[PDB]
């Protein structure tokens, strides 16, 4: 009764076939589940098999193999809305005749969206002054600065469903710079107005 | 619930020969339910030292058990098996009849 | 080897 | 659907508290798990059925009951600091077998003393001139700051009603002084609309931060206002 | 041609504590394991010599499952009480049997999983291992439970799969025991009644497996009616006994023939006085 599972986070671009694995050692596991938990919410079922083989819910494929002791989930056609922590779980008959549900530590998946026309900039916003790095490219990475008295936050994808538009944005602020704020992150030459 | 009375057969592991060590066997089967008392007697007295198999059961669902005891058969000695079950109103005795 | 499917009725 | 109550809760050390879990699905198996970073999901206690209860991997410091089928209460006689966790109740139709349905989660913080509970301050920041002119869109930033613990829920309201499009909130808060564990938190968000819509001054943009703090059932003896559960806001009007 | 079979029994003892539970394991007609709630070990225990090799991770897993059975039956006794509207003062029995048969080649042939309450059939897996047989509205409740939980499928997965592998392991691991063949040491006695008739008892001793056929034939025609036939019994040493017996009119004692059939004989025997 032990489950190992890569903690993540696994960053991939939209469209990439994700593969999540758990290996186990207990010969006695009979039920095998994939749970999807979206940050600050209660895990919800995604796949269930009691038997070996391969099951499919469209974009989703579950594989159990009792020989390798190997549980797999494949999300084909990654989408943004699949950023979650995916937990694997397995249950084994106990002597009180309960089935005990043992969970892997959970794999954090972050699936990046494709910015169609990256327009990177760093704006000064009208009021702890606030700097906004925005519109940058999905395959650019933003890093938390070294100046202890500044506050950089990770990149965040927003979506305007009506205008078929998506963009990335990070926020930095201190009590200045707004030219010196993101120098700790490796930013494309394009990004100051 | 269809209670069914035990079918008793007393007999010996191997063919009897006087002075040679054997087993005395009392086989109770077809009964239901499973509470049963069974004692192998020697000249009417209860042999201390009788083991018995693990309960199981046929397609019928009815139980059987074998009760057994090492002995050596002599000429004078009479052996029998005394069985009691809720299906009876007095315990049943079944004498051993080596000349079967 | 006994079974692992033991469910209540 | 499984229910937990309450969904947040703060206590000083030592006060007996109880998290009640409920379900009218007619399931017989219920258990309680905790979730802590890196440790994963650990079972605490469970119950295969009415009047039936049993310890889990981590039972020490917790007790339960199963007097009625539809409720499985989690009871902490004497809270410890390190009982601070996300607590999920799960139900199963029979034995624990097949699928297990999870509660929406109870977040719990057990403090040394309640000195450390601060309501959030809220501050909206208004679009950049250059941002409009360049891309013809308008990004608002809201900023929660100085709160403890992170029992917060941010939301954006556009003319009295809520609105989900063009909104991003950071998945995780952002410790203001990471060197301490008695450390207050900061958390940002973003709303974004077309230029013209923002440049319509008859449009009201409001960011709302719901804080789950103390109840009027918790002892206060500091100079300042009790950091009770409360909403804190900040407002901006579209500039033409 | 072979099989593995588990028999399981629980008997409630209202007023006097938890129900007595005994489980036992068979390969063909050979006992290889047991468990009794009333013994000290509280461990699955061996009963064949060839099984003792199995390491601690074996017995662990068996003892784990057997206890689960145990518990289920306990819970099942109380439930079944309610489906029948019975009180808490009577002693009641639950019985479960499952196993799998193979052929000459040791390939899957047949599977079964049977449950009986108070000595009558409750619910069983049908031949295809796909449906269930509800001999009640009470069992109708259970069926639903299982149908929804997809129990058939999983037991099928075990009955066709795991079942035959380990039986393969068992027959293999004990070939010098299990795939033996002891043939009927065949006999025949003659006794009186009342100066007028006599009995011919066809004996058969010391055979294995226990499967045998004793028929009687008068004038080349079998004598179905008027005949006494006892159940095969264990000698207590891995071998079985049986006998069949007929009363024949004094002086025809020689027109009667007994027919002993058993997979241990090259040619099916024929016996006469």
JSON list of N, CA and C in Angstrom, two decimals, chain A residues 31 35 37 41-43 48 96-101 103 119 123-128 130 135 151-153 156-161 165 167 169 173 193, chain D residues 35 41 43 46 48 54 57 88 95-98 100 102-103 124-128 131 134-135 137 141 143 164-166 168-170 174 176 186 190 192:
[
{"chain": "A", "resi": 31, "resn": "UNK", "atom": "N", "xyz": [-9.66, -1.29, -7.14]},
{"chain": "A", "resi": 31, "resn": "UNK", "atom": "CA", "xyz": [-10.32, -0.18, -7.82]},
{"chain": "A", "resi": 31, "resn": "UNK", "atom": "C", "xyz": [-9.30, 0.94, -8.03]},
{"chain": "A", "resi": 35, "resn": "UNK", "atom": "N", "xyz": [-8.74, 11.32, -10.19]},
{"chain": "A", "resi": 35, "resn": "UNK", "atom": "CA", "xyz": [-9.46, 12.46, -9.65]},
{"chain": "A", "resi": 35, "resn": "UNK", "atom": "C", "xyz": [-8.83, 13.73, -10.20]},
{"chain": "A", "resi": 37, "resn": "UNK", "atom": "N", "xyz": [-8.64, 17.68, -9.19]},
{"chain": "A", "resi": 37, "resn": "UNK", "atom": "CA", "xyz": [-8.88, 18.74, -8.20]},
{"chain": "A", "resi": 37, "resn": "UNK", "atom": "C", "xyz": [-8.36, 20.06, -8.76]},
{"chain": "A", "resi": 41, "resn": "UNK", "atom": "N", "xyz": [-10.86, 23.46, -4.24]},
{"chain": "A", "resi": 41, "resn": "UNK", "atom": "CA", "xyz": [-12.11, 22.77, -4.55]},
{"chain": "A", "resi": 41, "resn": "UNK", "atom": "C", "xyz": [-11.94, 21.28, -4.24]},
{"chain": "A", "resi": 42, "resn": "UNK", "atom": "N", "xyz": [-13.06, 20.55, -4.19]},
{"chain": "A", "resi": 42, "resn": "UNK", "atom": "CA", "xyz": [-13.03, 19.19, -3.69]},
{"chain": "A", "resi": 42, "resn": "UNK", "atom": "C", "xyz": [-12.85, 18.17, -4.82]},
{"chain": "A", "resi": 43, "resn": "UNK", "atom": "N", "xyz": [-11.98, 17.14, -4.68]},
{"chain": "A", "resi": 43, "resn": "UNK", "atom": "CA", "xyz": [-11.60, 16.33, -5.83]},
{"chain": "A", "resi": 43, "resn": "UNK", "atom": "C", "xyz": [-12.86, 15.79, -6.47]},
{"chain": "A", "resi": 48, "resn": "UNK", "atom": "N", "xyz": [-12.91, 5.72, -13.73]},
{"chain": "A", "resi": 48, "resn": "UNK", "atom": "CA", "xyz": [-13.01, 4.60, -12.83]},
{"chain": "A", "resi": 48, "resn": "UNK", "atom": "C", "xyz": [-12.90, 3.29, -13.59]},
{"chain": "A", "resi": 96, "resn": "UNK", "atom": "N", "xyz": [-11.55, -5.73, 7.75]},
{"chain": "A", "resi": 96, "resn": "UNK", "atom": "CA", "xyz": [-12.86, -5.44, 8.32]},
{"chain": "A", "resi": 96, "resn": "UNK", "atom": "C", "xyz": [-13.89, -5.45, 7.20]},
{"chain": "A", "resi": 97, "resn": "UNK", "atom": "N", "xyz": [-13.39, -5.70, 5.98]},
{"chain": "A", "resi": 97, "resn": "UNK", "atom": "CA", "xyz": [-14.11, -5.82, 4.72]},
{"chain": "A", "resi": 97, "resn": "UNK", "atom": "C", "xyz": [-14.47, -4.44, 4.19]},
{"chain": "A", "resi": 98, "resn": "UNK", "atom": "N", "xyz": [-13.81, -3.41, 4.70]},
{"chain": "A", "resi": 98, "resn": "UNK", "atom": "CA", "xyz": [-13.83, -2.13, 4.03]},
{"chain": "A", "resi": 98, "resn": "UNK", "atom": "C", "xyz": [-12.80, -2.13, 2.90]},
{"chain": "A", "resi": 99, "resn": "UNK", "atom": "N", "xyz": [-13.01, -1.29, 1.88]},
{"chain": "A", "resi": 99, "resn": "UNK", "atom": "CA", "xyz": [-11.99, -1.01, 0.89]},
{"chain": "A", "resi": 99, "resn": "UNK", "atom": "C", "xyz": [-11.32, 0.32, 1.25]},
{"chain": "A", "resi": 100, "resn": "UNK", "atom": "N", "xyz": [-9.99, 0.33, 1.40]},
{"chain": "A", "resi": 100, "resn": "UNK", "atom": "CA", "xyz": [-9.30, 1.55, 1.80]},
{"chain": "A", "resi": 100, "resn": "UNK", "atom": "C", "xyz": [-8.81, 2.33, 0.58]},
{"chain": "A", "resi": 101, "resn": "UNK", "atom": "N", "xyz": [-9.12, 3.63, 0.53]},
{"chain": "A", "resi": 101, "resn": "UNK", "atom": "CA", "xyz": [-8.76, 4.40, -0.65]},
{"chain": "A", "resi": 101, "resn": "UNK", "atom": "C", "xyz": [-7.46, 5.20, -0.41]},
{"chain": "A", "resi": 103, "resn": "UNK", "atom": "N", "xyz": [-4.28, 7.39, -1.94]},
{"chain": "A", "resi": 103, "resn": "UNK", "atom": "CA", "xyz": [-4.16, 8.39, -2.97]},
{"chain": "A", "resi": 103, "resn": "UNK", "atom": "C", "xyz": [-2.70, 8.69, -3.26]},
{"chain": "A", "resi": 119, "resn": "UNK", "atom": "N", "xyz": [1.86, 40.70, -27.69]},
{"chain": "A", "resi": 119, "resn": "UNK", "atom": "CA", "xyz": [2.14, 42.13, -27.71]},
{"chain": "A", "resi": 119, "resn": "UNK", "atom": "C", "xyz": [2.79, 42.59, -26.41]},
{"chain": "A", "resi": 123, "resn": "UNK", "atom": "N", "xyz": [3.29, 48.12, -18.04]},
{"chain": "A", "resi": 123, "resn": "UNK", "atom": "CA", "xyz": [2.51, 49.33, -17.86]},
{"chain": "A", "resi": 123, "resn": "UNK", "atom": "C", "xyz": [2.66, 49.83, -16.43]},
{"chain": "A", "resi": 124, "resn": "UNK", "atom": "N", "xyz": [2.66, 51.16, -16.27]},
{"chain": "A", "resi": 124, "resn": "UNK", "atom": "CA", "xyz": [2.49, 51.80, -14.98]},
{"chain": "A", "resi": 124, "resn": "UNK", "atom": "C", "xyz": [1.01, 52.16, -14.82]},
{"chain": "A", "resi": 125, "resn": "UNK", "atom": "N", "xyz": [0.38, 51.66, -13.74]},
{"chain": "A", "resi": 125, "resn": "UNK", "atom": "CA", "xyz": [-1.05, 51.80, -13.51]},
{"chain": "A", "resi": 125, "resn": "UNK", "atom": "C", "xyz": [-1.30, 52.84, -12.42]},
{"chain": "A", "resi": 126, "resn": "UNK", "atom": "N", "xyz": [-2.38, 53.62, -12.58]},
{"chain": "A", "resi": 126, "resn": "UNK", "atom": "CA", "xyz": [-2.74, 54.70, -11.66]},
{"chain": "A", "resi": 126, "resn": "UNK", "atom": "C", "xyz": [-3.22, 54.12, -10.34]},
{"chain": "A", "resi": 127, "resn": "UNK", "atom": "N", "xyz": [-2.53, 54.49, -9.25]},
{"chain": "A", "resi": 127, "resn": "UNK", "atom": "CA", "xyz": [-2.86, 54.08, -7.89]},
{"chain": "A", "resi": 127, "resn": "UNK", "atom": "C", "xyz": [-4.34, 54.38, -7.62]},
{"chain": "A", "resi": 128, "resn": "UNK", "atom": "N", "xyz": [1.86, 52.01, -2.69]},
{"chain": "A", "resi": 128, "resn": "UNK", "atom": "CA", "xyz": [2.24, 50.71, -3.32]},
{"chain": "A", "resi": 128, "resn": "UNK", "atom": "C", "xyz": [1.86, 50.74, -4.80]},
{"chain": "A", "resi": 130, "resn": "UNK", "atom": "N", "xyz": [1.74, 49.91, -8.73]},
{"chain": "A", "resi": 130, "resn": "UNK", "atom": "CA", "xyz": [1.52, 48.61, -9.35]},
{"chain": "A", "resi": 130, "resn": "UNK", "atom": "C", "xyz": [2.03, 48.59, -10.80]},
{"chain": "A", "resi": 135, "resn": "UNK", "atom": "N", "xyz": [0.50, 40.59, -21.85]},
{"chain": "A", "resi": 135, "resn": "UNK", "atom": "CA", "xyz": [0.38, 40.26, -23.27]},
{"chain": "A", "resi": 135, "resn": "UNK", "atom": "C", "xyz": [1.56, 39.43, -23.76]},
{"chain": "A", "resi": 151, "resn": "UNK", "atom": "N", "xyz": [7.26, 42.77, -4.78]},
{"chain": "A", "resi": 151, "resn": "UNK", "atom": "CA", "xyz": [6.38, 41.61, -4.82]},
{"chain": "A", "resi": 151, "resn": "UNK", "atom": "C", "xyz": [6.00, 41.27, -6.26]},
{"chain": "A", "resi": 152, "resn": "UNK", "atom": "N", "xyz": [6.59, 40.19, -6.77]},
{"chain": "A", "resi": 152, "resn": "UNK", "atom": "CA", "xyz": [6.29, 39.70, -8.10]},
{"chain": "A", "resi": 152, "resn": "UNK", "atom": "C", "xyz": [5.39, 38.49, -7.93]},
{"chain": "A", "resi": 153, "resn": "UNK", "atom": "N", "xyz": [4.37, 38.40, -8.79]},
{"chain": "A", "resi": 153, "resn": "UNK", "atom": "CA", "xyz": [3.47, 37.26, -8.82]},
{"chain": "A", "resi": 153, "resn": "UNK", "atom": "C", "xyz": [3.63, 36.53, -10.15]},
{"chain": "A", "resi": 156, "resn": "UNK", "atom": "N", "xyz": [-0.55, 34.66, -15.18]},
{"chain": "A", "resi": 156, "resn": "UNK", "atom": "CA", "xyz": [-1.96, 34.35, -15.03]},
{"chain": "A", "resi": 156, "resn": "UNK", "atom": "C", "xyz": [-2.59, 34.55, -16.40]},
{"chain": "A", "resi": 157, "resn": "UNK", "atom": "N", "xyz": [-3.35, 33.54, -16.87]},
{"chain": "A", "resi": 157, "resn": "UNK", "atom": "CA", "xyz": [-4.08, 33.56, -18.13]},
{"chain": "A", "resi": 157, "resn": "UNK", "atom": "C", "xyz": [-5.52, 34.01, -17.88]},
{"chain": "A", "resi": 158, "resn": "UNK", "atom": "N", "xyz": [-5.92, 35.14, -18.50]},
{"chain": "A", "resi": 158, "resn": "UNK", "atom": "CA", "xyz": [-7.31, 35.58, -18.52]},
{"chain": "A", "resi": 158, "resn": "UNK", "atom": "C", "xyz": [-7.90, 35.34, -19.91]},
{"chain": "A", "resi": 159, "resn": "UNK", "atom": "N", "xyz": [-9.24, 35.28, -20.02]},
{"chain": "A", "resi": 159, "resn": "UNK", "atom": "CA", "xyz": [-9.87, 34.93, -21.29]},
{"chain": "A", "resi": 159, "resn": "UNK", "atom": "C", "xyz": [-11.16, 35.73, -21.48]},
{"chain": "A", "resi": 160, "resn": "UNK", "atom": "N", "xyz": [-11.28, 36.41, -22.63]},
{"chain": "A", "resi": 160, "resn": "UNK", "atom": "CA", "xyz": [-12.47, 37.16, -22.99]},
{"chain": "A", "resi": 160, "resn": "UNK", "atom": "C", "xyz": [-13.29, 36.37, -24.01]},
{"chain": "A", "resi": 161, "resn": "UNK", "atom": "N", "xyz": [-14.12, 35.45, -23.50]},
{"chain": "A", "resi": 161, "resn": "UNK", "atom": "CA", "xyz": [-14.80, 34.40, -24.25]},
{"chain": "A", "resi": 161, "resn": "UNK", "atom": "C", "xyz": [-15.58, 34.96, -25.45]},
{"chain": "A", "resi": 165, "resn": "UNK", "atom": "N", "xyz": [-10.30, 36.01, -27.33]},
{"chain": "A", "resi": 165, "resn": "UNK", "atom": "CA", "xyz": [-9.00, 36.58, -26.99]},
{"chain": "A", "resi": 165, "resn": "UNK", "atom": "C", "xyz": [-8.52, 36.06, -25.64]},
{"chain": "A", "resi": 167, "resn": "UNK", "atom": "N", "xyz": [-4.88, 36.40, -22.89]},
{"chain": "A", "resi": 167, "resn": "UNK", "atom": "CA", "xyz": [-3.61, 37.06, -22.63]},
{"chain": "A", "resi": 167, "resn": "UNK", "atom": "C", "xyz": [-3.05, 36.64, -21.28]},
{"chain": "A", "resi": 169, "resn": "UNK", "atom": "N", "xyz": [-0.53, 37.81, -17.89]},
{"chain": "A", "resi": 169, "resn": "UNK", "atom": "CA", "xyz": [-0.21, 39.00, -17.11]},
{"chain": "A", "resi": 169, "resn": "UNK", "atom": "C", "xyz": [0.39, 38.59, -15.77]},
{"chain": "A", "resi": 173, "resn": "UNK", "atom": "N", "xyz": [4.75, 44.98, -7.50]},
{"chain": "A", "resi": 173, "resn": "UNK", "atom": "CA", "xyz": [4.46, 46.20, -6.78]},
{"chain": "A", "resi": 173, "resn": "UNK", "atom": "C", "xyz": [5.40, 46.32, -5.57]},
{"chain": "A", "resi": 193, "resn": "UNK", "atom": "N", "xyz": [7.06, 51.04, -22.29]},
{"chain": "A", "resi": 193, "resn": "UNK", "atom": "CA", "xyz": [6.41, 52.10, -23.03]},
{"chain": "A", "resi": 193, "resn": "UNK", "atom": "C", "xyz": [6.26, 53.32, -22.10]},
{"chain": "D", "resi": 35, "resn": "UNK", "atom": "N", "xyz": [-5.69, 17.11, 3.85]},
{"chain": "D", "resi": 35, "resn": "UNK", "atom": "CA", "xyz": [-4.78, 17.34, 2.73]},
{"chain": "D", "resi": 35, "resn": "UNK", "atom": "C", "xyz": [-3.78, 18.43, 3.10]},
{"chain": "D", "resi": 41, "resn": "UNK", "atom": "N", "xyz": [-3.02, 12.96, 0.58]},
{"chain": "D", "resi": 41, "resn": "UNK", "atom": "CA", "xyz": [-4.37, 12.85, 1.13]},
{"chain": "D", "resi": 41, "resn": "UNK", "atom": "C", "xyz": [-4.36, 11.71, 2.15]},
{"chain": "D", "resi": 43, "resn": "UNK", "atom": "N", "xyz": [-6.17, 9.49, 5.37]},
{"chain": "D", "resi": 43, "resn": "UNK", "atom": "CA", "xyz": [-7.44, 9.17, 6.02]},
{"chain": "D", "resi": 43, "resn": "UNK", "atom": "C", "xyz": [-7.23, 9.27, 7.53]},
{"chain": "D", "resi": 46, "resn": "UNK", "atom": "N", "xyz": [-12.98, 6.59, 9.58]},
{"chain": "D", "resi": 46, "resn": "UNK", "atom": "CA", "xyz": [-14.05, 6.26, 8.65]},
{"chain": "D", "resi": 46, "resn": "UNK", "atom": "C", "xyz": [-15.11, 5.46, 9.37]},
{"chain": "D", "resi": 48, "resn": "UNK", "atom": "N", "xyz": [-17.97, 2.36, 8.10]},
{"chain": "D", "resi": 48, "resn": "UNK", "atom": "CA", "xyz": [-18.55, 1.57, 7.04]},
{"chain": "D", "resi": 48, "resn": "UNK", "atom": "C", "xyz": [-20.07, 1.62, 7.02]},
{"chain": "D", "resi": 54, "resn": "UNK", "atom": "N", "xyz": [-14.05, 3.55, 12.78]},
{"chain": "D", "resi": 54, "resn": "UNK", "atom": "CA", "xyz": [-12.73, 2.93, 12.86]},
{"chain": "D", "resi": 54, "resn": "UNK", "atom": "C", "xyz": [-11.66, 3.95, 12.50]},
{"chain": "D", "resi": 57, "resn": "UNK", "atom": "N", "xyz": [-5.25, 6.12, 8.83]},
{"chain": "D", "resi": 57, "resn": "UNK", "atom": "CA", "xyz": [-3.82, 6.34, 8.94]},
{"chain": "D", "resi": 57, "resn": "UNK", "atom": "C", "xyz": [-3.51, 7.34, 10.05]},
{"chain": "D", "resi": 88, "resn": "UNK", "atom": "N", "xyz": [-11.37, 17.09, 4.05]},
{"chain": "D", "resi": 88, "resn": "UNK", "atom": "CA", "xyz": [-12.42, 16.62, 3.16]},
{"chain": "D", "resi": 88, "resn": "UNK", "atom": "C", "xyz": [-13.07, 15.38, 3.75]},
{"chain": "D", "resi": 95, "resn": "UNK", "atom": "N", "xyz": [-19.15, 0.17, 1.57]},
{"chain": "D", "resi": 95, "resn": "UNK", "atom": "CA", "xyz": [-17.93, -0.43, 2.08]},
{"chain": "D", "resi": 95, "resn": "UNK", "atom": "C", "xyz": [-16.73, 0.48, 1.95]},
{"chain": "D", "resi": 96, "resn": "UNK", "atom": "N", "xyz": [-16.86, 1.59, 1.21]},
{"chain": "D", "resi": 96, "resn": "UNK", "atom": "CA", "xyz": [-15.65, 2.26, 0.74]},
{"chain": "D", "resi": 96, "resn": "UNK", "atom": "C", "xyz": [-15.29, 1.87, -0.70]},
{"chain": "D", "resi": 97, "resn": "UNK", "atom": "N", "xyz": [-16.05, 0.93, -1.27]},
{"chain": "D", "resi": 97, "resn": "UNK", "atom": "CA", "xyz": [-15.71, 0.35, -2.55]},
{"chain": "D", "resi": 97, "resn": "UNK", "atom": "C", "xyz": [-16.04, 1.33, -3.66]},
{"chain": "D", "resi": 98, "resn": "UNK", "atom": "N", "xyz": [-15.75, 0.93, -4.90]},
{"chain": "D", "resi": 98, "resn": "UNK", "atom": "CA", "xyz": [-15.92, 1.76, -6.08]},
{"chain": "D", "resi": 98, "resn": "UNK", "atom": "C", "xyz": [-15.54, 3.20, -5.76]},
{"chain": "D", "resi": 100, "resn": "UNK", "atom": "N", "xyz": [-15.60, 7.20, -4.54]},
{"chain": "D", "resi": 100, "resn": "UNK", "atom": "CA", "xyz": [-15.80, 7.92, -3.28]},
{"chain": "D", "resi": 100, "resn": "UNK", "atom": "C", "xyz": [-16.04, 9.39, -3.61]},
{"chain": "D", "resi": 102, "resn": "UNK", "atom": "N", "xyz": [-16.44, 13.32, -2.90]},
{"chain": "D", "resi": 102, "resn": "UNK", "atom": "CA", "xyz": [-15.81, 14.23, -1.95]},
{"chain": "D", "resi": 102, "resn": "UNK", "atom": "C", "xyz": [-16.65, 15.47, -1.63]},
{"chain": "D", "resi": 103, "resn": "UNK", "atom": "N", "xyz": [-16.49, 15.93, -0.38]},
{"chain": "D", "resi": 103, "resn": "UNK", "atom": "CA", "xyz": [-17.00, 17.20, 0.11]},
{"chain": "D", "resi": 103, "resn": "UNK", "atom": "C", "xyz": [-16.31, 18.37, -0.57]},
{"chain": "D", "resi": 124, "resn": "UNK", "atom": "N", "xyz": [-8.13, 48.89, -5.85]},
{"chain": "D", "resi": 124, "resn": "UNK", "atom": "CA", "xyz": [-8.12, 48.67, -7.29]},
{"chain": "D", "resi": 124, "resn": "UNK", "atom": "C", "xyz": [-7.16, 49.69, -7.89]},
{"chain": "D", "resi": 125, "resn": "UNK", "atom": "N", "xyz": [-6.61, 49.33, -9.05]},
{"chain": "D", "resi": 125, "resn": "UNK", "atom": "CA", "xyz": [-5.70, 50.16, -9.81]},
{"chain": "D", "resi": 125, "resn": "UNK", "atom": "C", "xyz": [-6.26, 50.22, -11.23]},
{"chain": "D", "resi": 126, "resn": "UNK", "atom": "N", "xyz": [-6.20, 51.42, -11.82]},
{"chain": "D", "resi": 126, "resn": "UNK", "atom": "CA", "xyz": [-6.99, 51.72, -13.00]},
{"chain": "D", "resi": 126, "resn": "UNK", "atom": "C", "xyz": [-6.13, 51.58, -14.24]},
{"chain": "D", "resi": 127, "resn": "UNK", "atom": "N", "xyz": [-6.71, 51.18, -15.40]},
{"chain": "D", "resi": 127, "resn": "UNK", "atom": "CA", "xyz": [-5.96, 51.01, -16.65]},
{"chain": "D", "resi": 127, "resn": "UNK", "atom": "C", "xyz": [-4.88, 52.05, -16.98]},
{"chain": "D", "resi": 128, "resn": "UNK", "atom": "N", "xyz": [-3.88, 51.60, -17.75]},
{"chain": "D", "resi": 128, "resn": "UNK", "atom": "CA", "xyz": [-2.79, 52.44, -18.20]},
{"chain": "D", "resi": 128, "resn": "UNK", "atom": "C", "xyz": [-3.21, 53.14, -19.50]},
{"chain": "D", "resi": 131, "resn": "UNK", "atom": "N", "xyz": [-1.74, 51.34, -22.35]},
{"chain": "D", "resi": 131, "resn": "UNK", "atom": "CA", "xyz": [-2.32, 50.01, -22.52]},
{"chain": "D", "resi": 131, "resn": "UNK", "atom": "C", "xyz": [-3.51, 50.09, -23.48]},
{"chain": "D", "resi": 134, "resn": "UNK", "atom": "N", "xyz": [-2.37, 51.21, -27.22]},
{"chain": "D", "resi": 134, "resn": "UNK", "atom": "CA", "xyz": [-1.54, 50.26, -27.95]},
{"chain": "D", "resi": 134, "resn": "UNK", "atom": "C", "xyz": [-2.36, 49.07, -28.45]},
{"chain": "D", "resi": 135, "resn": "UNK", "atom": "N", "xyz": [-3.18, 48.50, -27.56]},
{"chain": "D", "resi": 135, "resn": "UNK", "atom": "CA", "xyz": [-3.82, 47.19, -27.74]},
{"chain": "D", "resi": 135, "resn": "UNK", "atom": "C", "xyz": [-5.35, 47.30, -27.80]},
{"chain": "D", "resi": 137, "resn": "UNK", "atom": "N", "xyz": [-7.53, 47.60, -25.34]},
{"chain": "D", "resi": 137, "resn": "UNK", "atom": "CA", "xyz": [-8.14, 46.83, -24.26]},
{"chain": "D", "resi": 137, "resn": "UNK", "atom": "C", "xyz": [-7.79, 47.54, -22.95]},
{"chain": "D", "resi": 141, "resn": "UNK", "atom": "N", "xyz": [-6.48, 46.00, -12.15]},
{"chain": "D", "resi": 141, "resn": "UNK", "atom": "CA", "xyz": [-5.84, 45.14, -11.17]},
{"chain": "D", "resi": 141, "resn": "UNK", "atom": "C", "xyz": [-6.44, 45.42, -9.80]},
{"chain": "D", "resi": 143, "resn": "UNK", "atom": "N", "xyz": [-6.10, 44.40, -5.64]},
{"chain": "D", "resi": 143, "resn": "UNK", "atom": "CA", "xyz": [-5.02, 43.92, -4.78]},
{"chain": "D", "resi": 143, "resn": "UNK", "atom": "C", "xyz": [-5.47, 43.75, -3.33]},
{"chain": "D", "resi": 164, "resn": "UNK", "atom": "N", "xyz": [-17.46, 36.97, -15.04]},
{"chain": "D", "resi": 164, "resn": "UNK", "atom": "CA", "xyz": [-16.42, 35.96, -14.95]},
{"chain": "D", "resi": 164, "resn": "UNK", "atom": "C", "xyz": [-15.39, 36.09, -16.08]},
{"chain": "D", "resi": 165, "resn": "UNK", "atom": "N", "xyz": [-15.87, 36.40, -17.29]},
{"chain": "D", "resi": 165, "resn": "UNK", "atom": "CA", "xyz": [-15.01, 36.72, -18.42]},
{"chain": "D", "resi": 165, "resn": "UNK", "atom": "C", "xyz": [-13.93, 37.74, -18.05]},
{"chain": "D", "resi": 166, "resn": "UNK", "atom": "N", "xyz": [-12.82, 37.69, -18.79]},
{"chain": "D", "resi": 166, "resn": "UNK", "atom": "CA", "xyz": [-11.69, 38.59, -18.63]},
{"chain": "D", "resi": 166, "resn": "UNK", "atom": "C", "xyz": [-11.13, 38.66, -17.21]},
{"chain": "D", "resi": 168, "resn": "UNK", "atom": "N", "xyz": [-8.72, 36.98, -14.17]},
{"chain": "D", "resi": 168, "resn": "UNK", "atom": "CA", "xyz": [-7.70, 36.09, -13.62]},
{"chain": "D", "resi": 168, "resn": "UNK", "atom": "C", "xyz": [-7.33, 36.55, -12.22]},
{"chain": "D", "resi": 169, "resn": "UNK", "atom": "N", "xyz": [-7.40, 35.60, -11.27]},
{"chain": "D", "resi": 169, "resn": "UNK", "atom": "CA", "xyz": [-6.86, 35.74, -9.93]},
{"chain": "D", "resi": 169, "resn": "UNK", "atom": "C", "xyz": [-5.73, 34.73, -9.79]},
{"chain": "D", "resi": 170, "resn": "UNK", "atom": "N", "xyz": [-4.63, 35.16, -9.16]},
{"chain": "D", "resi": 170, "resn": "UNK", "atom": "CA", "xyz": [-3.48, 34.31, -8.86]},
{"chain": "D", "resi": 170, "resn": "UNK", "atom": "C", "xyz": [-3.99, 33.08, -8.13]},
{"chain": "D", "resi": 174, "resn": "UNK", "atom": "N", "xyz": [0.63, 35.20, -1.61]},
{"chain": "D", "resi": 174, "resn": "UNK", "atom": "CA", "xyz": [1.98, 35.68, -1.89]},
{"chain": "D", "resi": 174, "resn": "UNK", "atom": "C", "xyz": [2.59, 36.33, -0.64]},
{"chain": "D", "resi": 176, "resn": "UNK", "atom": "N", "xyz": [3.95, 38.12, 2.39]},
{"chain": "D", "resi": 176, "resn": "UNK", "atom": "CA", "xyz": [4.52, 39.46, 2.38]},
{"chain": "D", "resi": 176, "resn": "UNK", "atom": "C", "xyz": [5.89, 39.49, 3.05]},
{"chain": "D", "resi": 186, "resn": "UNK", "atom": "N", "xyz": [-0.61, 38.55, 0.61]},
{"chain": "D", "resi": 186, "resn": "UNK", "atom": "CA", "xyz": [-1.03, 39.45, -0.44]},
{"chain": "D", "resi": 186, "resn": "UNK", "atom": "C", "xyz": [-1.52, 38.62, -1.62]},
{"chain": "D", "resi": 190, "resn": "UNK", "atom": "N", "xyz": [-7.03, 40.31, -11.88]},
{"chain": "D", "resi": 190, "resn": "UNK", "atom": "CA", "xyz": [-7.10, 41.11, -13.09]},
{"chain": "D", "resi": 190, "resn": "UNK", "atom": "C", "xyz": [-8.49, 40.98, -13.73]},
{"chain": "D", "resi": 192, "resn": "UNK", "atom": "N", "xyz": [-10.46, 42.55, -17.35]},
{"chain": "D", "resi": 192, "resn": "UNK", "atom": "CA", "xyz": [-10.14, 43.17, -18.62]},
{"chain": "D", "resi": 192, "resn": "UNK", "atom": "C", "xyz": [-11.35, 43.20, -19.55]}
]
